[PDB]
């Protein structure tokens, strides 16, 4: 079929300005993300530092689904640039600049570790003598 000698060409647009700023949301492949399970999600600025200078906090399906923290790309594209290329119904491409690149990583759920009451002390005594029972006595 034509598919073996197919040539395609599209126009490229780069609008000087857009009402919405454009971001990247990146995940590790190791994190095995599944967007089909994302019935709901929240996206709020983090609260550890207690706005435009803080990491992101992502909460999916609330307290039951997975929770992630977002950190701003520490490196800067001074000799390169990142763009998004999108298809439009007219038959052309639109390219949008990356305003930010955020690195998202899993927080843990009810893993629970006080590590304050006497865990530092128990560590002084720690001979890998126990592990399960101390986590339980909470």
């Amino acid at each position: 079929g034509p598919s073996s000698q197919n040539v395609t060409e599209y126009v490229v647009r780069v609008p000087k300005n857009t009402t919405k700023k454009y971001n990247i949301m990146a995940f590790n492949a190791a994190d095995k993300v599944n967007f089909a399970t994302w019935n709901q999600a929240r996206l709020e600025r983090d609260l550890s530092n207690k706005p435009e200078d803080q990491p992101w906090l992502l909460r999916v399906n609330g307290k039951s689904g997975r929770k992630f923290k977002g950190i701003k790309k520490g490196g800067v594209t001074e000799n390169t640039s990142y763009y998004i290329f999108t298809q439009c119904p007219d038959g052309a491409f639109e390219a949008f600049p990356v305003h930010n690149w955020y690195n998202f990583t899993p927080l843990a759920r009810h893993r629970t570790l006080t590590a304050e009451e006497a865990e530092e002390e128990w560590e002084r005594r720690n001979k890998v003598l126990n592990h399960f029972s101390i986590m339980q006595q909470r």
Binding site: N28, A29, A30, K73, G74, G75, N79, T80, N103
Partner: protein, 195 residues
């Protein structure tokens, strides 16, 4: 500028990757700092060498070394490395030719100089870290003899062997027919000879 060139060429930034999916790549270092990784070190190394000899990267101030058994490439642009000039031999022959020698003799009225000679890319400055990797030949004689000799892989060549000597060991005649501690003793007494 070295960081700029690498970034535009092909080197992936550390945050663009997941290590367990690309750890096999050659590592890149700039002044002891880990900038990124690369999947084709031989071409890139060849290209960097080609740029430094082309004057696009500051020759005297930039050393570039590949350690192939650890699949990493470190580059240094810091001050305080000791380096010396050496001839570049290619295809098992000198890259410097007699035409350049007659050009050097021409300088009694010509503006052609040592800097022009380096820009011809027939000589390079090689620091001790980089000197660990080269296959340095003692003389053009040996480099010719190679048709019977054991090695035919030279990359650099000594511009002359007596140059391994510092100032005072250089005033002294036939130093190799001297038992070696005698050469140290003269270099001291040489400062004490009044003139």
């Amino acid at each position: 500028p070295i960081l700029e060139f690498l970034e535009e060429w092909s080197m992936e930034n550390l945050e663009e990757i997941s290590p367990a999916a690309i750890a096999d790549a050659t590592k890149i270092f700039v002044n002891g700092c880990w900038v990124g990784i690369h999947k084709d070190p031989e071409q890139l190394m060849n290209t960097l060498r080609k740029l430094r000899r082309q004057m696009d990267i500051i020759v005297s101030e930039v050393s570039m070394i590949r350690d192939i058994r650890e699949r990493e490439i470190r580059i240094y642009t810091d001050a305080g490395r000791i380096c010396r000039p050496l001839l570049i031999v290619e295809k098992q022959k000198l890259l410097l030719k007699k035409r350049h020698i007659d050009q050097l003799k021409e300088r009694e009225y010509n503006n052609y100089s040592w800097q022009d000679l380096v820009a011809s890319g027939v000589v390079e400055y090689i620091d001790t870290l980089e000197e660990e990797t080269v296959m340095l030949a003692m003389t053009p004689d040996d480099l010719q003899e190679k048709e019977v000799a054991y090695c035919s892989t030279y990359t650099h060549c000594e511009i002359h062997p007596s140059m391994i000597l510092g100032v005072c060991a250089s005033i002294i005649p036939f130093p190799d027919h001297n038992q070696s501690p005698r050469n140290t003793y003269q270099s001291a007494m040489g400062k004490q000879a009044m003139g």
